[PDB]
């Protein structure tokens, strides 16, 4: 159901765009219901254990189920009062004192009731955690992926330059375990990023001897002492790249003698003959390193220890002892370096006790290392679930790094896993395997909202674990008291500090619908457990090859956080394990199938991707033999049958913001990055019309977000209105016949986070059929499904007497008069009644020193009336604070005595509207304290809220009653047709009298149950709302009532407001410029805006010119349609023109015309096309220059873009033909009014007497060092002296100079500033003394 | 101090002083009762810890306390490592064509709030307000006549404007306050280049000179009229920007025929012919009576009437030129680089007042003529070359032959990418040269009999050949093609962007171009902060010395010569010696000529050319040498400033 | 270098601004130094007329005035 189309683009749809806010919704949806992942998996540290220090045998708490069970205050009421969208966290425990076998406590068991373990905040319908009234939005984290990875560290580390590789195991919840090399090839280890210690110490800590450690890494080489000589187990492959020091011979044949080197040919000769036994000298064995210990069996004396260097003397003792097997290490200087031997050489600890004590001293340096403390500390490092965890994902990722078979395993690391990581690191050091990449997407998980909340809850449970264990261990009473054991403060504060206090939970930038969707789909690399700012570097921030498909290259912002914060792609989606997947069409060797597969970061590199730019046949195979394709991280070529996969759509890459740009391909990437940032800040204008030169994706963007009210169940519209909309379901209702209907409330005239007027308006008319999933009621910055950030302006590219200077915009008076860029704001002014030691501040209308203007705006109580026009100076809420004493100077007492005293003991602190702004009061409010005298206006407003809500609920019940009675009467007229006899009965008679047997009477029983349910639900909802309305309203811990005043203002397009286009075309409005003196053509039509042409050529944003030229073609067909509509029907059913308009796009592909339909139905679509024809140029496969030239025809226009225009003031024609068109501009945020400050004199700070405000005036402008350098350069000593002392921070100098300025003397009369004098006192406060001598 | 509704806000020094007082009091009590050696010594160490923490925490451990996890701010921390000022404000910038050089559009509400005390004093002095409180009530309720009093207050009272990124001395500049009905601060287009300011939502701050000497300092030193020339280089800082230069470029450009002919006139009378149609504008080599004016030796002015073959635009633009100067030949050239040179020569010959009025006249005439021209940027302006596909196919054929050679050994496969990059770079030069040669000349026209050529009036080419933000590389990227794109690793890609901005761009090439845009923005962010980091070290070291002791003796100095890269590259630059004091009579081919301490003037520097190319070495006094004690000699320094 | 040259200076208050304040103030407290203010940076923090441009003559008059004692 749509009365507007517009069509363009060549390539097919294939796969439609998914839910835009799927990642935000699905992540939080996981953390709630499912087992071993979300909420249940969050309590993995409190599923089995919680053993109370081995007291009463063992014992436990044991979690068993939970559930939330509805809300408390709801989302709408949580916006008004300062309270989050909360939901009570119940959880049934079961305290038991069951041991293993016999004695102590004997199987009690309670099955205790559920306890309130804090309160976790729930997500709204469209992804938003409401906290204390504010909207809020939790952005996704892009941290480093858990598991293990070998870092490069290549280049100049410490001069010379020689690789220095290193391994590093990153845990999910535990301590880090690094493993790095040095210049001398020594293996170190870093426990939780600490001081370096020998890697063999960790092996000793896991109960491994020096001989056992030697047999793990290096290969042994046995030597035999027989027949008074030295033999050796020769291995041919081991002698590759080594010089022969002795005569290598076997079986009476000298293969390689002693001198020259051993080549690969000698290895083939040795391997062919099968030589595994040859004689060797004493000097050759001296070079090797002995593996195990060797004691002399004759005397019992130890001849050298493990890992010691051999010698001529040592080998003589070993031969004399009578040992038949001399175990030694082989090694080399290429593929098998002696790293573990060198690490053992510089290792102090020789056993498990010394290793654990050394590790205990390194970790916790202070207390003396004991037996239990040293073992338990090492045990709680990488061998315990409470103090170490790789999760289900990191262990799977660790297995892939080590080349394992299975992907499942334990959380904590084993003894074999550490040795395997060290073995792979040793292989990577030599020449086996390659290094990993940090910038690649394979080692970068997407930690969303669900993971962070469960992680914070895991920390909160760890806090309560020590309290529960200590209390249960000490106490041993027969009574349970399990609900009172676990406190609510620890769990609630853990969740509350993360949700609306910690980083990542930023304010929801809801200027427009695109800003909310872009904010929800954002992904930052910094925050809790990741990057920051000072680190970061060139890598990571730069756009990697794996980003193509996952994230947008252009959408990342400027400044300090450029590269760290990247937006998610359109077709992208988060994987199950944590990685970022991306869709791709399956091509089964030649023919491209209709199926789609989500390829991971690592998985995508293996297969051969293919671009969507290459055209295909009618159905199946490709056109060209060789086309463009991506494979192995490079954009090479391939054969026709070689391609495995294909691109899903043309806009697979890039974000939703970049996709909204019309001619994105024609614009530069630098300007496109600015153009993405230019959007979102586009404020919601009054009556937002649909954009002419569109993309097509804007239709999905508005419907994706919760701004526009989409139809849940399709049917027919019953009652349409500004207040609400009600649609009868009609076609296929629910299972049980419990009435049709579908009430849509639709919020209207509400303030946003950026002070923007958020409202909803009914697009669909009364008595109109509508299908499921369509825009019933539109929202702010939209036009019946299609999004609209601004309004279309008749632009003109030409110079205009220095008005459009360095990217300045020259507007027209017709734009301001029509109210095209008129922004409606909604400010909220507060007025808190405080309570001092002297007395309590009361809100009253009897304010001291006030005339007739008080009672004009304010009421009898002292609050402004709803709908009164206010200005900068008028009082909104009257209030006075008690303050006696005074004293009063002699002149003031005599002055008061002359004109009546009236010196009351009370000051004034009424909530007045700020000087400058002005508007109308929309809605007042009053949050009264619990146990205080309620005001007359407060009771009147509360009575209005109670009456309106009760009438709304009563009318809501009446709407359901009309549908329910119609549904019952429809069912009742099939079997027992009363017909004209019916429709003259009461209410009670209608309920009675049912049908016969079969499916009729049984359905009517459930209808009566649903009718009685609605009757009971009306009283329950009314009683709940009545209790909530007339509640205590407990505010903050200050005192007394408070009064909020929502006043709306309407600002016009003043000269200075920052207005910009869609292709990074930044601008500022210069002057007003009347319609009489503006650029006009042969006809009477003038120009809406006049932009400078010099800006288009400097920055490569040529797509803006394409948007202007195509906009003229879009407007041209609209003028032709308006010409047909005006002066009667004329043609009457002119479908051939509209069919030719839709069809004629170079006769390419992808279009539909009015084949079906009828008269009047076409007139609905034709009336919408009067303003503009509208176009949908996608992004990559957009409208070409030839198609735009074709679009220039039909509606009658110059096939070029140029057009001769008269001046307006003079009336003469311009020399060159100027480029006129329709550019889709938009009024951005910031603007004038807010960005405009001035201050002569105001308040000052207590610490240092320097200009500051906010309460009444604004704070003074800062000079700084850069300004002082310019003042010193020019030689303005008096200007710098006045700015430093008297103008800024001189106590006596400011008042003296101000008195001189009032008298007309000027001068200065300066002195020593308070900033310097405080430094003198601060320096003198210490032991040093500073004194200013005279001369 | 008590905050809002209880909850006091105390400093960390109160906690440190209380801890030191408590430990010292316990130590005093310990030295009185039973005195154990362990207890008394430990309390003394605790008193040392409290006293050390109070003076300066910093190093050893850091004493926490006071709930918060962060350390307490000690006395040393308070003074270890931005001066807010009253009578100031800020607002969004805007263009103001009608304003003069020494003028800036200040808002009515902002100027009223800024000059509060002056308005109160001026009101009470004349009459109207009986007292100061009455003037405050009269000023609060803006009652018409107060605005008239505000006009008198800011008549000859300079307001100091200022930008955010204050690099040089020209960042802060003063101007006469002009009242404007609006909420945005207007500014002069000529002085926008000095501040490095654009109209993309940039805001500037204003400051009012309260003191009498401060107002004189703003007028004499900090004024925009005084700051004509740059401090770094002798050339003009407030030269005509994009819009004005494009209009002056349009005012030249001699197009043959097209309502041309040699219809003679006398200067000012040609303006009547231009406004009344008939004749075109940049038509032909039309003759006209040019009344020139020159001076020599004894100063004065000497007239010189003559019939020079100029254009209608050059004849009309000649009225804007001052009394002095060469005349005709300045306007006869064009508007691009010589537009700034004409202003520099006018400033050197005439003075400050004549050059300032000429700058305002050139800005007004440039803006008006640029409006009358109507130069646009259509789709057909950037005309692509016909031999782009042919050159790309030929370059791809050469690269295919090189790849085919590498397949069968022959050439060095290790360095084949460098030679292939040279082939693509040569193809990029061929596409750039073909696009430039076609877009530069072009055209046909009808010179009397019809059949001729001159230069393409194609908007972008006119913008490119007249400053106006239009380089050769940007124009090459638009119509021609983007060259060798940079990769993330550092190396260049072997397949450059064959397509351009005029044509369609593929997803692969745009993805590759995103790395250049991301790296360009990131490097610009780093280099911007790094420039200020280097400037802080330069300022900290240098900002003690000043020119003092009038002018000391000392002849010795650096022998100034032309920076010769001509040994094996052809590159000369003999503009170093200008406004520099001579060491001592620095010879001449014969005798005499140069004086002892004579500063090389602008005209006297031209006299060095009269001594031929042989004299390319002159000893000059510099700031490196000089026999001054604690400063610098005024002669040894030079002159190069705005003055 | 520029950093090495800027490190050495006569006035302690000027050195206390840019460089490490704890080291400069402690060293200047040991030996009884005194900033006879001729510098620009040291005079700016005190809040007086800078010895350059519109000043200079005021500083030169005060410098000559401090020759008596």
Curated annotation (Swiss-Prot), chain A:
This is DNA-directed RNA polymerase subunit beta. Pfam families: RNA_pol_Rpb2_1, RNA_pol_Rpb2_2, RNA_pol_Rpb2_3, RNA_pol_Rpb2_45, RNA_pol_Rpb2_6, RNA_pol_Rpb2_7. It comes from Escherichia coli O157:H7. GO terms for molecular function: DNA binding; DNA-directed RNA polymerase activity; ribonucleoside binding. Keywords: Acetylation, DNA-directed RNA polymerase, Nucleotidyltransferase, Transcription, Transferase. InterPro entries: DNA-dir_RNA_pol_bsu_ext_1_sf, DNA-dir_RNA_pol_bsu_external_1, DNA-dir_RNA_pol_su2, DNA-dir_RNAP_su2_dom, DNA-dir_RNAP_su2_hyb_sf, RNA_pol_bsu_bac, RNA_pol_bsu_CS, RNA_pol_bsu_protrusion. It catalyses: RNA(n) + a ribonucleoside 5'-triphosphate = RNA(n+1) + diphosphate. Disulfide bonds: none annotated. The RNAP catalytic core consists of 2 alpha, 1 beta, 1 beta' and 1 omega subunit. When a sigma factor is associated with the core the holoenzyme is formed, which can initiate transcription. SUPFAM superfamilies: beta and beta-prime subunits of DNA dependent RNA-polymerase (SSF64484). Belongs to the RNA polymerase beta chain family. Its EC number is 2.7.7.6. DNA-dependent RNA polymerase catalyzes the transcription of DNA into RNA using the four ribonucleoside triphosphates as substrates. HAMAP family: RNApol_bact_RpoB. GO terms for biological process: DNA-templated transcription. The gene is rpoB. It is an enzyme of class 2 (transferase). GO terms for cellular component: DNA-directed RNA polymerase complex. The modification N6-acetyllysine is found at residues 1015, 1193.
From Swiss-Prot, chain C:
Signal peptide: none annotated. It comes from the Bacteria. DNA-dependent RNA polymerase catalyzes the transcription of DNA into RNA using the four ribonucleoside triphosphates as substrates. Belongs to the RNA polymerase beta' chain family. The RNAP catalytic core consists of 2 alpha, 1 beta, 1 beta' and 1 omega subunit. When a sigma factor is associated with the core the holoenzyme is formed, which can initiate transcription. This is DNA-directed RNA polymerase subunit beta'. The chain holds residues 1308 to 1376 of 1407 of the full protein.
